[PDB]
Every structure is written in structure tokens, then in C-alpha cells.
From Swiss-Prot:
One of its GO terms (molecular function) is Hsp90 protein binding. It is linked to Okur-Chung neurodevelopmental syndrome: An autosomal dominant neurodevelopmental disorder characterized by developmental delay, intellectual disability, behavioral problems, hypotonia, speech problems, microcephaly, pachygyria and variable dysmorphic features. Residues 37-322 form the Protein kinase domain. This is Casein kinase II subunit alpha. Residues 34-39 are annotated as: Interaction with beta subunit. Expressed in gastric carcinoma tissue and the expression gradually increases with the progression of the carcinoma (at protein level). The lineage of its organism: Eukaryota, Metazoa, Chordata, Craniata, Vertebrata. It comes from Homo sapiens (Human). Phosphorylation does not directly affect casein kinase 2 activity, but may contribute to its regulation by forming binding sites for interacting proteins and/or targeting it to different compartments. ATP binds at residues 43-51, 66.
């Protein structure tokens, strides 16, 4: 069977917590007043909810309302407890209220409003400096939630709200987030395809915070190379092959060999043999101004097969890539 794995940081944070902190199943929701909020515009619809721009008539503040669908239930308490545990943290979206929607008859989460601009349009205009600046801001959020014993598990541009005018950033949609418990096996059906870590793609369940750092790496690669997405799989199997065509197959086998993992035999015919590529390969006249030796070294230390070898969020904040960012 597979070799066990543990996070190299924040390993035991939850074990030293009162049960209440992580025992989300027992959490008692404190309900607010649904009539405080008036829905204004439907923004979108997720797999697990519909999202509205709304107004808090008890102060005329714009808010965001996520009305939860009859989900996996108990997943409701998980997201609520995590939001409450993380509230006030650096660049963590603020849960302002929890009300019972009268029509859906499900909980509706009320969030602070953020005047974001579509990541596509925004990732077209970011300067080198701005990439570094916002990466650092995302790292603050990630080190915070990791330090609080929580992994986000859905890091992607769609879940980073950026108000470019005021240069503020929020990490949102904690619906897939989980408490990290050493030795616990987790569902590998998390994150979005292009941002899935190798551990998910090879069905290794005993993963940790370092999943988020692979995802962050995928974001970084897409930004500095102007390639969206960087690893463009057609499905979850092709996703790993796309990764292997860059990181090489030898280090992939070293990885699965370390954890005594067996690849799905359907990879026999599609994986092939691939050398590790130098990152310079992806540099060209159109993205060169976004690339530096520091950027490439930083990316290289995020995008590692072995989840145990990736930079942690705090280590990432130490990297020379961020020396130019005003703190």
C-alpha cells in the first residue's frame, strides 16, 4: 500500500485545538435576519450555489450573497466554520452574515463586497511588479489559513477577487476547504482540472496544505508566461501527461515510487517518456518582460511533483522574487 505522508509545517495545529474548532459537524449556526438583504443582480451559479450581488439595507452596503444548493450537506457547516475560524485574517474574504433564504430554504452566506475585474482581462494587463505584488498578497492568505490548520483546495484565478483600483485582494470560495489532520485521507476530487496537483492526479489521498502551493504555481506560470492555462489537460488523465511533458516522466516515477504509488494502468499507452524541460523554453518576446531569474527559480520550487518538496507559503514569501515588492 501507499507510504503515508505528513505536512512539514503546521502538522499538529488541529490536534491541540478544542474539538469545537475543527468539529464542524457539531457547529451551531447563528442566524441573522434575511430581510436585511435585498438581492440586486444574479452574478453566477456554481455547482453548489447561486451568487448574488445584494444590498444590506441596514447600512446600504453592497454585499455578496451565496445561496447554497442542497449540497452534500454538512459541507454547509464545514464552509461556515472555516469562514468563521479564518475571519479577520489577511486577505481572507469576510463572512458578514448567515441567513435562511425563504425561497430556497437553505443557508445563504453573506460576504463583504469586492469590486473585482475578470481575471482574464486583468491577467492581460498585469505588469511584472503587479504579478509579484499580488502573488505576495495571495501568499499572506495562504500562509494564514495553513497556519490555522486549513487547506483551501481550490486555488485558481476565479477564486481570487482583485480590486485593482485599490490594489486589494481577497481569497474566496472556501466551499472545498478542509481541516488538515495528520494521517487523514482526503477526497482527490477537489480543485479545478488545470490547477490539480500531481497528488490528486495519481489518486494519493494523504495530501496537505502543499496542494495549494502547486495550484499557486500553476497560476504563476500562467501569468509570467502569458499562457492560460499553463497545463491544458483535456481530462484528468491528459492533465498529468501535460504536466509530465514539462516536469519530465523520470521525476514523476521517482515521486510515485517514493510513496509506493501505482499509476492507473491507462497511463501505459499515453504517458510516454519525457525529459524535464528548462523553464527558458516557455519564454518568448511577448512574455519576456514578466520573466526574471528570480521568477523562474520561484516557479521551479512551487511546481514540484513531490508535495513534500514544494515551498511552503512562508518559505515562498522569503523568496528573492519578492525582494522588489514594497513592504
Amino acid at each position: 500500500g501507499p507510504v503515508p505522508s505528513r505536512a512539514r509545517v503546521y502538522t499538529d495545529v488541529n490536534t491541540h485545538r478544542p474539538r469545537e474548532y475543527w468539529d464542524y459537524e457539531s457547529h451551531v449556526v447563528e442566524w441573522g435576519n434575511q430581510d436585511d438583504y435585498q438581492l440586486v443582480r444574479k452574478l453566477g451559479r456554481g455547482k453548489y450555489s447561486e451568487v448574488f450581488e445584494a444590498i444590506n439595507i441596514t447600512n446600504n452596503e453592497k454585499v455578496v450573497v451565496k445561496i447554497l444548493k442542497p449540497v452534500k450537506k454538512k459541507k454547509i457547516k464545514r464552509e461556515i466554520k472555516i469562514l468563521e475560524n479564518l475571519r479577520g485574517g489577511p486577505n481572507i474574504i469576510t463572512l458578514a452574515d448567515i441567513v435562511k433564504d425563504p425561497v430556497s430554504r437553505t443557508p445563504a452566506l453573506v460576504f463583504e463586497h469586492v469590486n473585482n475585474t475578470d481575471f482574464k482581462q486583468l491577467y492581460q494587463t498585469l505588469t511584472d511588479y503587479d504579478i509579484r505584488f499580488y502573488m505576495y498578497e495571495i501568499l499572506k492568505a495562504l500562509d494564514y489559513c495553513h497556519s490555522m490548520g486549513i487547506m483551501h483546495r481550490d486555488v485558481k484565478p476565479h477564486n481570487v477577487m482583485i480590486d485593482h483600483e485599490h490594489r486589494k485582494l481577497r481569497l474566496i470560495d472556501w466551499g472545498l476547504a478542509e481541516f488538515y489532520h495528520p494521517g487523514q485521507e482526503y477526497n482527490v476530487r477537489v480543485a479545478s482540472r488545470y490547477f490539480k496537483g500531481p497528488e490528486l492526479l495519481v489518486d494519493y489521498q494523504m495530501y496537505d496544505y502543499s496542494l495549494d502551493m502547486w495550484s499557486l504555481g500553476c497560476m504563476l506560470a500562467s501569468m509570467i508566461f502569458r499562457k492560460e492555462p499553463f497545463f491544458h489537460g483535456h481530462d484528468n488523465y491528459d492533465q498529468l501527461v501535460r504536466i509530465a511533458k514539462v516536469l519530465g516522466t523520470e521525476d514523476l516515477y521517482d515521486y510515485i515510487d517514493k510513496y509506493n504509488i501505482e499509476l492507473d494502468p491507462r497511463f501505459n499507452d499515453i504517458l510516454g517518456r519525457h525529459s524535464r524541460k528548462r523553464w527558458e523554453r516557455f519564454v518568448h518576446s511577448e512574455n519576456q518582460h514578466l520573466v526574471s531569474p528570480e521568477a523562474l527559480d520561484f516557479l521551479d520550487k512551487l511546481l514540484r511533483y513531490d508535495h513534500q518538496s514544494r515551498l511552503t507559503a512562508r518559505e515562498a514569501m522569503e523568496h528573492p522574487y519578492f525582494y522588489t515588492v514594497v513592504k
